[PDB]
Amino acid sequence: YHEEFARAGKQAGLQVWRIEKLELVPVPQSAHGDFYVGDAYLVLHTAKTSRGFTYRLHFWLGKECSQDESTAAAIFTVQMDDYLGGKPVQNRELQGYESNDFVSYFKGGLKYKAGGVASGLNHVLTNDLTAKRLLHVKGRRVVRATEVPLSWDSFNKGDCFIIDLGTEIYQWCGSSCNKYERLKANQVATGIRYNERKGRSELIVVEEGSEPSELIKVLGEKPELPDGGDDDDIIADISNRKMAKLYMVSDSMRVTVVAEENPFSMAMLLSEECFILDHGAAKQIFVWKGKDANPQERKAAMKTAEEFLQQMNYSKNTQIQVLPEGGETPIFKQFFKDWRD
């Protein structure tokens, strides 16, 4: 019913919408990758196949968005899903914990902008040039630029920071950060100048201990810098250990174990029921919904999955992927020894 659903999934490519006071508002192509820290988004990826149209539906939740702001995103995803006839694959995306597939849609990386709809902020593209902000650039695999308070308190020796003053962008490189971190932060700074300023802006690379007068004017005198925190985010352990479990959901919700170790057999998946493939140790849980399974139980898959994490004492930041029968992902299918299409 909401106007945009009519625009959704018509042709191949990526479509980003931001939930603005219970309404779907498109996010322009240039703004793709920028997400407000206090907002909820809907990301739809359309793939053309011979005949077929394959959908990868994602709902991104901001760190500062409310419980009710999060609820609206979940409803919109359910409405979008049945609007697309239960053909799409749904994913709950959490800020700083989003999946590889979601991450792969934005080549320049992710930009976490402070504020949101409550601060009156828009994705409406502007020449701008009046901007004053600070971006903390972190991550080796995935480049994440986070909007941090524009002061020396945010700073650390081991990382790269981008001071965006509008007409000029400063790439502050910490004394103890390597070549890879410098290049990645540069790509973000080049991204602002070209994408947001149209190349009018000027890029100045700044070294710690050598900051210009303009920088120390806004920021003030530079004090001692804390040693760069080593994030060393958890990386999947490679072994011959079979860490996945197969569960069947029996309506609150009751989980019954099907298989105590992967590889699973395709026959275990019954069209009459909803299943949970647990790979919680590797940060991923999958909700497989049978074609002849109860429709009310199918719609509550996201809620069922969140309850599963809580019951099995997993982190609330575990990746949730909801799959319809026949719309299984290559990652889900590979847990099976006898997968047949």
Residue numbers in the entry: 6 to 256, 260 to 349
In the authors' words:
Adseverin (also known as scinderin) is a member of the gelsolin superfamily of Ca2+-dependent actin-binding proteins, which regulate cytoskeletal dynamics by severing, bundling and capping of actin filaments. Adseverin is composed of six GH domains (A1–A6) and shares 60% overall sequence identity with gelsolin (G1–G6). Adseverin was first identified in chromaffin cells of bovine adrenal medulla, where it acts as an actin depolymerizing agent that disassembles the cortical network of actin filaments in response to bursts of intracellular calcium, leading to exocytosis of secretary vesicles. Crystallographic studies revealed that these binding events involve the association of eight calcium ions, six of which bind at a conserved site on each domain (type II), whereas the remaining two are also stabilized by contacts with actin (type I; refs 17, 18, 19, 20). Both proteins are able to sequester two monomers of actin, as well as sever and cap actin filaments through distinct Ca2+-induced domain rearrangements of the two halves of the molecule.
We crystallized A1–A3 in the presence of EGTA, revealing a compact auto-inhibited structure similar to the conformational state observed in inactive full-length gelsolin. Purified recombinant A1–A3, supplemented with 5 mM EGTA, crystallized in space group C2 and its structure was solved by molecular replacement using the structure of G1–G3 excised from inactive full-length gelsolin as the search model and refined to a resolution of 2.9 Å. Each domain adopts the classic GH fold, which is organized around a central five-stranded mixed β-sheet sandwiched between a long α-helix running approximately parallel to the strands, and a shorter α-helix running approximately perpendicular to the strands. The domains adopt the compact arrangement characteristic of inactive gelsolin, with A1 sandwiched between A2 and A3. In this inactive conformation, the long α-helix of A3 is kinked to enable the formation of the A1/A3 latch, resulting in the masking of the major actin-binding interface on A1. The structure appears to be relatively rigid, with B-factors indicating that flexibility is limited mainly to the extended A2A3 linker and the short α-helices of A1 and A2. The inactive forms of A1–A3 (iA1–A3) and G1–G3 (iG1–G3) are highly similar with an overall root mean squared deviation (r.m.s.d.) in Cα positions of 1.19 Å over 337 aligned residues, highlighting the structural conservation between gelsolin and adseverin. The iA1–A3 crystal lattice is stabilized by a number of crystal contacts, including a relatively large packing interface of ∼1,518 Å2. Interestingly, comparisons with full-length gelsolin show that this interface largely buries the surfaces in iA1–A3 that bind the C-terminal half of the molecule, suggesting that the crystal environment partially mimics the inactive full-length protein.
